[PDB]
Design an enzyme around this catalytic site. Structure first.
Site, PDB file in Angstrom:
ATOM      1  CG  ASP A 125      -2.077   0.909   1.162  1.00  0.00           C
ATOM      2  OD1 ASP A 125      -2.430   1.347   0.046  1.00  0.00           O
ATOM      3  OD2 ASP A 125      -2.680   1.194   2.216  1.00  0.00           O
ATOM      4  CD  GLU A 128      -9.724   6.185  -4.061  1.00  0.00           C
ATOM      5  OE1 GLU A 128      -8.783   5.597  -3.477  1.00  0.00           O
ATOM      6  OE2 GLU A 128     -10.743   6.589  -3.460  1.00  0.00           O
ATOM      7  CE  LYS A 185      -8.072   2.269  -2.802  1.00  0.00           C
ATOM      8  NZ  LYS A 185      -6.663   2.143  -2.360  1.00  0.00           N
ATOM      9  CB  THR A 240     -11.316   1.761  -1.370  1.00  0.00           C
ATOM     10  OG1 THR A 240     -10.525   1.977  -0.196  1.00  0.00           O
ATOM     11  CG2 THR A 240     -11.625   3.097  -2.034  1.00  0.00           C
ATOM     12  CG  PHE A 243     -10.446   1.392   5.161  1.00  0.00           C
ATOM     13  CD1 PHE A 243     -10.506   0.842   3.889  1.00  0.00           C
ATOM     14  CD2 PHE A 243      -9.817   2.610   5.326  1.00  0.00           C
ATOM     15  CE1 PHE A 243      -9.948   1.506   2.802  1.00  0.00           C
ATOM     16  CE2 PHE A 243      -9.261   3.272   4.240  1.00  0.00           C
ATOM     17  CZ  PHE A 243      -9.319   2.714   2.984  1.00  0.00           C
TER      18      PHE A 243
END
EC number: 2.2.1.2
Length: 316
Positions: free
Chosen positions: A16, A95, A131, A155, A177
């Protein structure tokens, strides 16, 4: 061996970060970025060439400054993804502008534009995950995109309703998350310390995992956002886990084998009827943490997008 190596036995490791150094050090299968990470990556001196290439490319596409800033900003995210793909065998998650999170049509258009940029660089769709924030609108966008050969990474997933909606839309992967869930509980609750097994984020992801496997959903469950290695270990067995370099380093420097924690050994069960928008909204809003965190995550990503545009603008 070390924890990181042991982890790979049960879970696919994902990095990440938008920093290529981490890719070289940990050999992750995939890599994920987001607006904040891209903004941070842009500060890295060696990435200067990537920015210059983005800007130069933009000016060659149009003479309209407005369009140029947008083209440059998208090209930058893609360029960073390009560098990463050179070091990972898997996928890169890029994203879409978070300012489009509540606009299904604008989100589909943006997703397709990014895909276009990747394809323009010779990269095919199977190496990319677009994303999007898991709002009802982002989920509806994803469902459409998947049908068009574009795989998505849903996400900012906090509530069970979001989890269920994503599975029902047939999205390629979700990034529920863990850390941000813990953050909310630490700030809005009496309990400040949690043992790994009782960590709200860990519990959340575990229940999502069981629900997905129990119903034979093909959506990849990739736990994201971590505050400590305890959460990571408690999730050993999850399909994939995208981990920040700092924690990756911690796992690599810790000796000891670990045991698989997440598993579903039963048989697949029949899926229920699809949840409607009304039910989704009702259920998502029943969760105070999810309500705060989803909205907040989108705001922060939007701000970082603007900061990036600010930067790019000064270079045109």
């Amino acid at each position: 061996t070390d924890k990181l190596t042991s982890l790979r036995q049960y879970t696919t490791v994902v990095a990440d970060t938008g920093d290529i150094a981490a890719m070289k050090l940990y050999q992750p299968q995939d890599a994920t970025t987001n607006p904040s990470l891209i903004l941070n990556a842009a500060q890295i001196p060696e990435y200067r060439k990537l920015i210059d290439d983005a800007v130069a490319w933009a000016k060659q596409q149009s003479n309209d400054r407005a369009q140029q800033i947008v083209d440059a900003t998208d090209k930058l995210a893609v360029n960073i993804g390009l560098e990463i793909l050179k070091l990972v065998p898997g996928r890169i998650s890029t994203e879409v502008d978070a300012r489009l999170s509540y606009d299904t049509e604008a989100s589909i258009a943006k997703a397709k534009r990014l895909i276009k940029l990747y394809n323009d660089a010779g990269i095919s769709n199977d190496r990319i995950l677009i994303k999007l924030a898991s709002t009802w609108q982002g989920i509806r966008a994803a469902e459409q995109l998947e049908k068009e050969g574009i795989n998505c990474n849903l996400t900012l997933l906090f509530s069970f309703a979001q989890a269920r909606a994503c599975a029902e839309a047939g999205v390629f992967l979700i990034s529920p998350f863990v850390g941000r869930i813990l953050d909310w509980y630490k700030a809005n609750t009496d309990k400040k310390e949690y043992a790994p097994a009782e960590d709200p984020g860990v519990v959340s992801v575990s229940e999502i995992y069981q629900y997905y496997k129990e119903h034979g959903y093909e959506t990849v469950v990739m736990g994201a956002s971590f505050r400590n290695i305890g959460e990571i270990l408690e999730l050993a067995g999850c399909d994939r886990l995208t981990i920040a370099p700092a924690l990756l380093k911690e796992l690599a420097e810790s000796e000891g084998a670990i045991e698989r924690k997440l598993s579903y050994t039963g048989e697949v069960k029949a899926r229920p009827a699809r949840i409607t928008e009304s039910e989704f909204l009702w259920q998502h809003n029943q969760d105070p943490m999810a309500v705060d965190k989803l909205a907040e995550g989108i705001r922060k990503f939007a701000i970082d997008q603007e900061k990036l545009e600010k930067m790019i603008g000064d270079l045109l």
